[PDB]
Amino acid sequence: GDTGSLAGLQAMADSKYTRAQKKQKMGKIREMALKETALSVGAQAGLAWRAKIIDEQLNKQARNLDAIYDFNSLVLEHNILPPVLLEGRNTLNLADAQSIRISDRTYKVAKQAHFITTPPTWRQYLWMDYVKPEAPNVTLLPKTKAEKEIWCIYTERGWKNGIDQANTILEENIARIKEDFGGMILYRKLLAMNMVSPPYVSHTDLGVTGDGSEIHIDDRVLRITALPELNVNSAEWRAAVAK
Amino acid sequence: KETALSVGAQAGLAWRAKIIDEQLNKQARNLDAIYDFNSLVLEHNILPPVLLEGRNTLNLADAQSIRISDRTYKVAKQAHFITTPPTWRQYLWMDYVKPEAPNVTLLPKTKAEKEIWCIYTERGWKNGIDQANTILEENIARIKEDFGGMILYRKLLAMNMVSPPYVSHTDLGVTGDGSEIHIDDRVLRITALPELNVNSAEWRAAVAK
């Protein structure tokens, strides 16, 4: 070896290692073709298998998820979704030398409130898709037992990689839906604190309408006039206390 | 053979790199003990600037021309904001990648070839040792210069040789539109970098007992 390389380069002067180090070139150039395919098929099969395991474990806990992600408690009285809010505390940034800016808190409107027909569930957020691949295509095949076994263990490596990929996708979905739910509950908190504007929507009605051929008995339309937004009137904010 | 001494130099350089990295890792606590940059910072999270000294300056520019002075000082790097104090690993942890691929183009076949391989690999090994030691010496001299510059600014400021840096801070209330808000706006800018004062009349003496 090259670690204790004085003894190593004294030892690798042996002529048997000269004729044994030559024969690994074709083995390397064949094994590197084998291992990427092994990793690919292990990644595919393990990823699909882990995905459907996650899907059926999700299906086993159907009641509690729909319990905890209740948007029907979250909706507003004109069938209008609350907006999404993000917050941050103790912000600072250096822009360059002799250029600093700090702020205690900041708040951001992420997605504007809008009209909704049906309340969203959690299933579209937390469902993972499942395509079973029934076509394992192996063009290059190993020759002897050693390359077969290292092909097997590198397939195991790809299997682990596909499992980790599925886990990362799952937690990213969890983060996204948690962020949206937190934005809704932030809107409820700010509406309680009176630092934001409630949404105002007007409506106008007409009686019987239409021609002699097509009629509606009534015709009520509604348009939102005032979107929710934050205020800057600092003295007009109500605080909170506990006991 | 020349490639053999080259790869021996590679092996010796990597081996001394690993040895010196183990030895440096052995003394982690004392390095952070002695290089207290976090004490050496100033109150506005600002790095104090770097100064260099010089005593008994003489130059012979040419014939009929001599310029001498007693002492002089130099601003090396101006003061600036910092975020986290630097550590010794930013200057002392020398890099290491082990080369494990000696492609022997010249395999030995005679015992004389083995012997000359041994002696030239030994020469490369020693050369790698010397190079690694030179690299370490360069790095430690550099970081010694940095710490000395910081300490030199501190004591010249103690001796009233440099004005301290001056910072103006402006604070504003709430800001933004109805969608984006920051609740307070504190902006700090350093309007006066440290610099030498040529009016020597303000200088003050020093004694010991």
Partner: protein, 165 residues
């Protein structure tokens, strides 16, 4: 940028006997270019002591370009130009057919000649007349050489000739 005439590898997946050259493609699996695949052909030799592969249509995936490097092939892990195949395909078939035709001709004529000094007559008959036509047809077919055949799982070397980018 490829330096003028350095060493690369390719992995061969499909085989052919050296009879009708055509598009045969390898896949470069390591190096600067990944996923690249390369079409080419071979040449027909008079003497079967080695066999080379000439590669011309090199394409890299990702973008639509077609660089036009011409290169040769060597057998790797020996660093020589020989091909790992068989060279003794049809020596013995034509040799034995010709020698049997000869032996038939000789049997009919010599055991006809030794008559002075019915079944053995019919032996003379059959050998005497089926020696001749088979002898001239064996001299007709004696000229087909021994071919070689590359294999569909043997890697190969690509030593370059010109520069591409």
């Amino acid at each position: 940028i490829i330096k003028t005439g350095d060493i690369m590898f390719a992995v061969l997946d499909t085989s052919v006997n050296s009879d009708e050259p055509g598009p045969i493609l390898a896949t470069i699996v390591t190096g600067k270019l990944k996923g690249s695949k390369l079409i080419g052909s071979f040449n027909l030799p008079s003497n079967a002591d080695k066999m080379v592969i000439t590669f011309n249509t090199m394409s890299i995936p990702g973008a639509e370009k077609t660089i036009s490097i011409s290169a040769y092939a060597i057998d790797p892990n020996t660093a020589r130009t020989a091909l790992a195949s068989r060279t003794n395909h049809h020596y013995l078939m034509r040799y034995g057919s010709l020698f049997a035709s000869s032996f038939l001709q000789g049997f009919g004529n010599a055991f006809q000649s030794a008559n002075t000094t019915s079944t053995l007559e019919n032996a003379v008959i059959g050998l005497a007349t089926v020696g001749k036509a088979w002898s001239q047809q064996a001299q007709q077919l004696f000229n087909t050489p021994t071919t070689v055949e590359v294999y569909s799982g043997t890697g190969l070397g690509i030593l370059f000739t010109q520069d591409v980018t």
